Design an enzyme around this catalytic site. Structure first.
Site, PDB file in Angstrom:
ATOM      1  N   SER A  57      -4.678   0.192  -9.412  1.00 53.01           N
ATOM      2  CA  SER A  57      -3.437  -0.460  -8.972  1.00 53.01           C
ATOM      3  C   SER A  57      -2.389  -0.764 -10.061  1.00 53.01           C
ATOM      4  CB  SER A  57      -3.750  -1.729  -8.177  1.00 53.01           C
ATOM      5  OG  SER A  57      -4.225  -1.416  -6.875  1.00 53.01           O
ATOM      6  N   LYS A  75       0.868   0.917  -9.606  1.00 53.09           N
ATOM      7  CA  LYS A  75       1.835   0.608  -8.563  1.00 53.09           C
ATOM      8  C   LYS A  75       3.135   0.077  -9.157  1.00 53.09           C
ATOM      9  CE  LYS A  75      -1.896  -0.704  -5.392  1.00 53.09           C
ATOM     10  NZ  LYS A  75      -2.515  -1.884  -4.724  1.00 53.09           N
ATOM     11  N   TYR A 112      -0.548   8.775  -3.948  1.00 49.54           N
ATOM     12  CA  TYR A 112      -1.140   7.458  -4.178  1.00 49.54           C
ATOM     13  C   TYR A 112      -2.475   7.498  -4.914  1.00 49.54           C
ATOM     14  CZ  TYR A 112      -2.827   2.676  -3.099  1.00 49.54           C
ATOM     15  OH  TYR A 112      -3.292   1.383  -3.122  1.00 49.54           O
ATOM     16  N   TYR A 166      -2.277 -10.194  -6.359  1.00 51.70           N
ATOM     17  CA  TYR A 166      -2.514 -10.418  -4.933  1.00 51.70           C
ATOM     18  C   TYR A 166      -2.688 -11.881  -4.552  1.00 51.70           C
ATOM     19  CZ  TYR A 166      -3.464  -5.623  -6.094  1.00 51.70           C
ATOM     20  OH  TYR A 166      -3.328  -4.368  -6.658  1.00 51.70           O
ATOM     21  N   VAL A 219      -8.614  -2.428  -9.677  1.00 52.11           N
ATOM     22  CA  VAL A 219     -10.012  -2.656  -9.352  1.00 52.11           C
ATOM     23  C   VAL A 219     -10.960  -1.964 -10.312  1.00 52.11           C
ATOM     24  CG1 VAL A 219      -9.674  -3.197  -6.952  1.00 52.11           C
ATOM     25  CG2 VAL A 219      -9.838  -0.832  -7.632  1.00 52.11           C
TER      26      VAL A 219
END
Lengths: 299, 298, 299, 298
Positions: free
Chosen positions: B50, B53, B177, B229, B247
Site C-alpha cells: 500500500s 498508493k 493495482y 487507515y 501490509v
C-alpha cells in the site's frame, strides 16, 4: 495587510450564506505578542456549541490524566456524522470512537470530576476561566430550548449508558453536555483559546502554563483528525490547520509556531449558516481562503 | 546520537514481533543535506504494497490534475478497514472516501493516463523513477501469487465498476493495482520518497521540483488523515507525523522543516503487522522516535 | 368466474405499468386436476431470472441433502436488497443469510454437483426437466448481455470466495448463476412449478413424486420469508401466499390444499415493469387483488 | 396421545435449559371445542414481555385502523436483533420496519388512543380483557426494575422521537411499553390468545368476533415474519407455525384450521433463552410438535 485582507474576504464571502442554514461573518486572529485583528461580526456573542468539546476533553485529561480518558474514549475518526449512533451498536464492545463527535463528548462529560452536573460543570468552568480569564456566561434560553429537544443526544447518551461508557447518570450527563454547549463567546474568546493551544498550553499573554503540553498537543491532534467531523479530511487537505466547529456557526482554528503569523496564532471565526456536516459554510470559505493565501498548512 | 539511538531502539523493539503476524526490523532516516542513518534490516528489499498508493495518487494528480481526481475520489477517513467494502454500497452514489483505502486506490489506478494497464503502469514507473532515481523492480513472484487470490480486492473493483467509479476495465485495474503493490524497495527508497514529500516535492539531492508543490502537500494531508487507515487517529495523537504503511511491513513517514531541523524522510521495515495492517514493531519504533525527539507536527 | 375475473383485473391493472421500469401483464393459474386458466400475456416467453433460485436451491438440496446446504447458507430474511453486499463483511464469519438473495443463490450454484459450470448446469437442467417436462431453453442474448455486465454479482461472488462460502471458482459460479437466470419460460411453466411445490413435490398431472416433500416444503418456507426480498413482509401481510420474483418481471406463487382452488394451485404471473424491490409492479397488484378477493392467505 | 406425548417431550427437553440464560418448561394447547392439554410448568405465571407487542399492535389497529398504523410502522423483517437501533438512523426517514421489534412496538405504544400512558394502557388492558377474559395483572416488581434500567429501549424511544416516529412523549411511551411487557400470564392465557388469532379473531369459547378478522390476519402475518426476530426464518423453515416470543421465556404460537384439525393455540414457557431472545427449551419443544404432528402451514 492581514487586517485589510480579512475585511476584504469577509465582505467577499458574506454572500454565500444563502447556501447554508445567517449572513453574519466574523473573524479574529491573535498572536503571542498581543497583536489582534478582526473584521465582520467578531464581537457578536454566540454559544460555543461543539467547540466546548475541546475544552471538556482538556479538563477531563487534566483531572483524570490522559490514560484514564483513553480507556473511556478513543481518538479515531468515524467517517460518520457528529451525532451518528450506529458505531455504538455495531462496533462492540461499543466504545465511542473519539471525544469530538457527540457520543465521545457525552462520555467525556460523564467522566469529568464531580458527583453532580453542578460539581462537574464547576470544574469545567474553572478551567475555562484559566483560559479566557473569566467565568463562562451561559445562554439559558438556548440551554432550555435544547434541554427540551435533545432527543438524538439522549438516545446517544442512553445507548452509552447501556454499553457502560457513561461514568454518570444520563440526564446528569446531558445537563453537563448541554450547558458547555451553551457557554457564550465571541471570535475573540475562541481565538485566544487556539493561541493557547497553538503554544502547547502556554498563555502567551499571561505568561503561565495553563494547560499541560501533552494534553494541549493531544487536543490539537484530535481537532485536525475529528474537529470538523466527516469533513476533517477535506479541511486537512484544503486548510491543513487544526480546527473545531460548533453548529451555532463557530470555528476555532490555530497555527503552531513557524511571513504572516511566523510566531503562530489562534483563529476565531463566526458564521451562523452551516453546511451538511455542521460546519460554518462561509466561515469555512473564509478559513480555506486564508490558509490558502498565507499558506498556513502544517503539512 | 540519532545513529546510535536508532540502533538501540531497533534492537529493543525487534523482539515484539511475536505479537503480530516477522522478527525483522529496519529503519532509515534521510536529510536534505544528504546525511543518512540506518539500523537493522534497512537494506532488505520488500514490496511497497500500500505505500505505493501515495505515488499512484501523486501520479494521477500530475496527469489528470487534482480537480479531476477529486471528482472520482474523496479525501475523507472511513473509520473502517483498508479493504472494507461497506461504504461503496451504503454511501450512495458510492464515491470511494479516500485514495489510501483499497477502494480509492483502485479508483485511482483506473484513472491513471493510458489505454491499457501497461501504459498506466509505465506512467507510474516513470514518476516513481523521478523519485527513487531508477525504474522500480517488480517482485514477479509475489504479484503472480496475489493475482490468483485477490478476491476481496476484486469484489471492491467490481463494485466500483457497478457504481461507475472505475474509468477502466476491472481486470485491467487489478493488474495496475496489484503491480504497483509489488514494486520493490528498501527503507532507503521510501525514506527518500518521504524526504521529497517533506519538502513539498522538491528533491533535495538533485535540487529539482519533481512533484507539483500543491500535489505533494495534498499527498501529505492524506497520509496524516488516512495513511494508517482506521489507526490514523492514534497515529496523529501518538506519533503526529504523516505516515503510510503496507501490509508487507513497510512504513513511510516524514517530518516537515522545523534534531532534523530541516525535515526528513523515514523508511521503516517490520513484516509483523497488527489488526489494522500496520507494522507492529515498525509502528512502535516510529512512535519512540516521535516521542523522544518530538517530531509531532502538532 | 375465475377465468372471467382474471381477464378483468388484468385489464384493470395493466395501466399502472407506467409507474414501473412494460405494459404487458399475464397470468395463469393451474389446479391438480388439470384445470388451467389464463389472461393477458400468459404465453409470452421471458427469462425466469431470480425465480430459478428456487429450483437451484431445490436441486442442491436433493443432491447434497438439506444439512449440507444449511451449512453453506442460512434461511433468514436480510432486510436488505436482493443484491446487497454489506452483510457479507459485517456479519462475520460472513455466511450468506438465505438462498433467495443474490449472495446465497450464488453460494447454492457453487455447491451444485459437478466440477464445471456445465456439469453443475446439467444437474440443474435435468431437475428442471422433471418439473416442466422438457429441457430449459436459454436466452443466449440475455445471458451474453448479462455476462458482460454482472459487476454487482461478481463483487458478491468474489467476496463470498474470500470468506470461503463458494464451493467453486468465481467465474465458474457466475456462469451457472447467469444461465439459470436466463432459462426461458412462460406463466404456464412457472404456474406448474408452483402447483408441484403446492403439493409438496408431487406432480399432480404426472402422478409422480418429483421433489422430496421436506425439500419442497423448505422451498415454500423460504419463498414466503425471502421470496420477495425486503418486500416479503408486505407480501405475507397483504397476499399471504408463498411467492418468488424475477427482475425480468415474473412471479411464481402457489396455494397449498384448503370455494376457489380448494384443492390448491400454482400461480404464474408476468409483468415486465418492476418496483424498487425488483418485484413486478402490476404483477404484484394483480396477485394482491386475487389473494384479497378469493382469500388465499395461508394465515 | 397428545396429552401424553407432551408430557414425554417436556420431560425430555427440560434438561437442555443448561445451554441458555431456567430449568422450567411448560406448555398448553387449546382447541375451539374447549379441549385443553398441558404438561409441566403450564400454570406458573410469567410476564408476557414481547408477546404483548402483538396485542398492542392489534389494539392500535382496532383504534386507529390499519391504514393509520402502516403510515407509522412497516411490516418488514429487519434481519437484526429485536432491540437493534441501526435502521432508525441508516434507513431514512427512519420508519421502524415492523411492530415486533422493540423500535416498532414503541412506535405502536405511542399511537394507542389516549392523552396519557394511563389512558393508552386502559385501552390496551380492555382489548387484552376481551381476549383472556379478565383485567391483566401487572408484575409491579418487574416493571419497577425495568423502569430504572431500560436504557437500550430509551435510546430507541428517543431516536424515534427525533425522526418523528413517536406520536407521544418518550417517557410516556416507555411507561405504556414497559407496562404491557409486565402483564402477567400463564401458558393457558397466551394459548387462548393464540386460538382466537388462529380463528381470525373469533373467540371459540364465547362465540364472538373479538378482533376484526383482517386485523387478526395481519397480526398472524407479522408473527410468522417477525415474531421471532432474526430467527424467524429458521422458524418458518423448521416449525412453520406463526409464533411470538418474550425474553421472559414465553412463546405464543397457533395453527390455522386444517391432530388439531380445527386449529389451536399454543402457550409455552421456558425461561432460558437463546441469543435471539427466544426460549431455548420452549423453542425445541415447539419444533418437535411441529415436526411430529406436521403443523407447518407450508
Amino acid at each position: 495587510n492581514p487586517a485589510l485582507q480579512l475585511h476584504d474576504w469577509v465582505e467577499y464571502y458574506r454572500p454565500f450564506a444563502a447556501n447554508g442554514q445567517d449572513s453574519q461573518l466574523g473573524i479574529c486572529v491573535l498572536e503571542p505578542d498581543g497583536t489582534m485583528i478582526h473584521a465582520g461580526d467578531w464581537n457578536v456573542s454566540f454559544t460555543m456549541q461543539s467547540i466546548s468539546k475541546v475544552i471538556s476533553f482538556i479538563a477531563a485529561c487534566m483531572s483524570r490524566g490522559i490514560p484514564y480518558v483513553l480507556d473511556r474514549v478513543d481518538v479515531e475518526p468515524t467517517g460518520d456524522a457528529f451525532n451518528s449512533i450506529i458505531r455504538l451498536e455495531i462496533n462492540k464492545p461499543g466504545k465511542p470512537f473519539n471525544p469530538m463527535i457527540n457520543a465521545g463528548a457525552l462520555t467525556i462529560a460523564s467522566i469529568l470530576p464531580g458527583e453532580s452536573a453542578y460539581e462537574k460543570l464547576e470544574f469545567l468552568y474553572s478551567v475555562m476561566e484559566t483560559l479566557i480569564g473569566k467565568r463562562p456566561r451561559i445562554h439559558e434560553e438556548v440551554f432550555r430550548s435544547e434541554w427540551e429537544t435533545a432527543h438524538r443526544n439522549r438516545a446517544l447518551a442512553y445507548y452509552l449508558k447501556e454499553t457502560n461508557f457513561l461514568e454518570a447518570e444520563v440526564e446528569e450527563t446531558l445537563e453537563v453536555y448541554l450547558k458547555q454547549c451553551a457557554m457564550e463567546s465571541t471570535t475573540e474568546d475562541i481565538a485566544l483559546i487556539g493561541l493557547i493551544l497553538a503554544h502547547d498550553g502556554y498563555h502567551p499573554i499571561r505568561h503561565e502554563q495553563v494547560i499541560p503540553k501533552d494534553v494541549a498537543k493531544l487536543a490539537k491532534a484530535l481537532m485536525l483528525t475529528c474537529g470538523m467531523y466527516n469533513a476533517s479530511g477535506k479541511y486537512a487537505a484544503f486548510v491543513g490547520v487544526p480546527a473545531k466547529s460548533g453548529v451555532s456557526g463557530g470555528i476555532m482554528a490555530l497555527v503552531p509556531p513557524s511571513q504572516p503569523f511566523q510566531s503562530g496564532c489562534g483563529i476565531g471565526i463566526y458564521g451562523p449558516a452551516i453546511d451538511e456536516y455542521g460546519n460554518s459554510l462561509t466561515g469555512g470559505m473564509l478559513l480555506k481562503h486564508m490558509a490558502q493565501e498565507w499558506e498556513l498548512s502544517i503539512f
